[PDB]
Ligand binder design. Structure first.
Ligand SMILES: [Zn+2]
Length: 62
């Protein structure tokens, strides 16, 4: 519902905030565009850590 909210306005872990910024992600929609395996490939993390970001932004923007 709030796909255009900035990722920096959420209390994501410091480590994943750094990874999102360094790989060029800006908004909720930039993350929620992707499945866990797609997001983990881009951020160079494992699938479960990608799932975690996705599920948290899904509940927070709804
Ligand atoms: Zn895209």
């Amino acid at each position: 519902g709030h796909m255009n909210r900035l990722l920096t306005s959420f209390p994501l872990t410091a480590s994943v905030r750094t990874k999102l910024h360094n790989k060029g992600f800006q908004t909720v929609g930039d993350v929620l565009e992707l499945k866990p395996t797609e997001l983990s490939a881009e951020l160079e993390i494992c699938k479960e850590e990608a799932l975690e970001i996705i599920k948290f932004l899904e509940e927070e923007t709804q």
